[PDB]
From Swiss-Prot:
Residues 12-130 form the PID domain. The chain holds residues 582 to 704 of 760 of the full protein. This is Amyloid beta precursor protein binding family B member 2. Expressed in the brain, retinal lens and muscle cells (at protein level). Interacts (via C-terminus) with APP (via C-terminus). Interacts with APLP2 (via cytoplasmic domain). It is found in: Endoplasmic reticulum; Golgi apparatus; Early endosome. Plays a role in the maintenance of lens transparency, and may also play a role in muscle cell strength. Involved in hippocampal neurite branching and neuromuscular junction formation, as a result plays a role in spatial memory functioning. Activates transcription of APP. Disruption phenotype: Knockout mice develop cataracts from 16 months of age with defects such as ulcer-like anomalies in the cornea, and opacity in the lens cortex or wider lens. Decreased muscle strength, however clasping ability is unaffected. Impaired spatial memory retrieval and learning. Reduced branching of hippocampal neurites and increased fragmentation of neuromuscular junctions. APBB1 and APBB2 double knockout mice show progressive retinal lens disruption from 1 month of age, morphologically lenses show massive vacuolization, lens capsule rupture and disruption of the lens fiber cells organization. It comes from the Eukaryota. The gene is Apbb2. The lineage of its organism: Eukaryota, Metazoa, Chordata, Craniata, Vertebrata.
Length: 136
């Protein structure tokens, strides 16, 4: 390592980590909507028990959503960005959070998660970042 080391700065950003479980990744056709959202969750929900879901952490910063493991603050299970997001919301139960992301090739992935006591702060912390129009 001939080259020295990078030079950090005495200033960081605000990050919000939330220990949530990882239900799994279910694809969806509609990048927007709740029905499908819930449907996705409910689908995953049934799949794999609750305890089966690995306790992960949801990092939120720089308007991004990165799912970091529990036994590793460096590991990045899933890396989602509010800029690549399409939609989301809280499933049937308030203890569930899923959002449709954009990967490319007309493909969308919905990452289901379990937040307690409710995915209100998470969804918000994530939404506050997304912050999109309603086009009503």
């Amino acid at each position: 390592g001939s080259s020295g080391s990078s030079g950090p700065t005495p200033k960081t950003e605000l990050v919000q980590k939330f220990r949530v479980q990882y239900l799994g990744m279910l694809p969806v056709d509609r990048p927007v909507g709740m029905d499908t959202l819930n449907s996705a969750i409910e689908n995953l929900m049934t799949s794999s028990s609750k305890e089966d879901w690995p306790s992960v952490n949801m990092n939120v910063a720089d308007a991004t959503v990165t799912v970091i493991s529990e036994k590793n603050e460096e590991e990045v299970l899933v890396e989602c960005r509010v800029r690549f997001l399409s939609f989301m919301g809280v499933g049937k139960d308030v203890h569930t959070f899923a959002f449709i992301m954009d990967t490319g090739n007309q493909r969308f992935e919905c990452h289901v998660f379990w937040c307690e006591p409710n995915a209100a702060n998470v969804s918000e912390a994530v939404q506050a970042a997304c912050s999109g129009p309603s086009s009503g």
